[PDB]
């Protein structure tokens, strides 16, 4: 996939005490045109893993299909073993790298969130096969706009509560709406804890336009 058609913008992710939260807007962009304003870019993988994706939407749908089948296949066995967030992150990394090596990349940047054995997981996988883990993540334009704010809060308070992480994410979504031209004021927030994966949406950020009068 050298020419991505419909693409999604930034995906945010931050760890908190006992879970991971990820956010993404519901926009499917066709160049600069906001073509699909109601598409979910966040997918539940299993009970402990969630996936957010930016970039080519068709590639994300294909990855969602393949990943979804894998999980179903594993569940059929009923042997007591299931894919952990780390294992899915590793699988995705190999998948992306393989595609990139044949000069036919899956044009996506992904954020993997998960909670297993009392440990929160947050992984990043780009289209070139570049992968790593961090306390907070932001793809695309979020790397320049959201990440700085996220990191700043984590430099003063490394361990956040669920409520703090949620509020911090909403603040980032507002900034993205103000400064990213391919963004849309309609997003989803997915949370993974010990109780499983939950997806809230659609949500909107409160916007201030006081400066226009100035």
């Amino acid at each position: 996939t050298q020419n991505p058609m419909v693409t999604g913008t930034s995906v945010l992710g931050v760890k908190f005490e006992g879970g991971v939260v990820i956010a993404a807007d519901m926009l499917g962009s066709y160049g600069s045109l906001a073509r699909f304003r109601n598409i979910s870019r966040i997918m539940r993988v299993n009970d402990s893993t969630m996936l957010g994706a930016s970039g080519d939407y068709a590639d994300f749908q294909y990855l969602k299909q393949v990943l979804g089948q894998m999980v179903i296949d594993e569940e059929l066995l009923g042997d007591g073993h299931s894919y952990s967030p780390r294992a899915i992150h590793s699988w995705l990394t190999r998948a992306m790298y393989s595609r990139r090596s044949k000069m036919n990349p899956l044009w996506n940047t992904m954020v993997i969130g998960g909670y297993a054995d009392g440990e929160s997981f947050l992984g990043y996988v780009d289209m070139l096969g570049v992968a790593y883990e961090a306390p907070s993540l932001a793809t695309g334009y979020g790397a320049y706009l959201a990440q700085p704010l996220l990191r700043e809060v984590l430099e003063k308070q490394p361990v956040l509560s669920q409520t703090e992480a949620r509020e911090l994410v909403e603040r980032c979504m507002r900034v993205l709406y103000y400064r990213d031209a391919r963004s849309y004021n309609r997003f989803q927030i997915a949370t993974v804890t010990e109780k499983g994966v939950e997806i809230e949406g659609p949500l909107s950020a409160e916007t201030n336009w006081e400066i226009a009068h100035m």
Binding site: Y97, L128, V130
Partner: protein
């Protein structure tokens, strides 16, 4: 579309009489942004071998996994652990198999040889390699190598005793060159990870670097 990305990072290795040091910074980058400040570039292969990699992180992750599998395969068919020099010889052939679509990785191996002396091997991306006394690789490699030539190799000095390098001196020197490299190289920073390989095993040490 480009299949590569420059992710920065610097790796250093120094061989002593009965030790080898492999050190690296922990910043992972892309463009002008930082992906993470906690990505060490040195992996343990065996109890007396460490590899330091730098370059395109996509190839760095894949090559390390491939080497790790080849060490297990070698052990199963030869009934022993691969030595530092056999790992160096084998890595050369793995890098040369992608001679037309290369791994963009600069490797440096640090460990002990069969006589328990420090050994360092440096590689270019397509497999060419040689044994050296010390070596810098990656983003700040041209800043560090001249200083190691003067302070460890004693080049350009007259009336100087060529004493053997001790672990203590080698450790301070490693910390100093990385502190100097973090000031000038934009890709080098955050933290320094130092692995010391001796006959007693591999010990690790972490030291902070400038965050800007």
């Amino acid at each position: 579309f480009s299949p590569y990305a420059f992710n920065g990072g610097t790796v250093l290795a120094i061989a002593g009489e009965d030790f080898s040091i492999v050190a690296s910074d922990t910043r992972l980058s892309e463009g002008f942004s930082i992906h993470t400040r906690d990505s060490p570039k040195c992996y343990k292969l065996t109890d007396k071998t460490v590899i330091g990699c730098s370059g395109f992180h996509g190839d760095c992750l894949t090559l390390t996994k491939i080497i790790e599998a080849r060490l297990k395969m070698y052990k199963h068919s030869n009934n022993k652990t691969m030595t530092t020099g056999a790992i160096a010889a084998m890595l050369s052939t793995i890098l040369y198999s992608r001679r037309f679509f290369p791994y963009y990785v600069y490797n440096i191996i640090g460990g002990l040889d069969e006589e328990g002396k420090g050994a360092v091997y440096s590689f270019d991306p397509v497999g060419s390699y040689q044994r050296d006394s010390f070596k810098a690789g990656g983003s700040a490699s041209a800043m560090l190598q001249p200083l190691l030539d003067n302070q460890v190799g004693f080049k350009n000095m007259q009336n100087v005793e060529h004493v053997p390098l001790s672990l203590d001196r080698a450790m301070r020197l490693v910390k100093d060159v990385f502190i100097s490299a973090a000031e000038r190289d934009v890709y080098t920073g955050d933290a320094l990870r130092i692995c010391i390989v001796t006959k007693e095993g591999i010990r690790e040490e972490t030291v902070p670097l400038r965050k800007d």
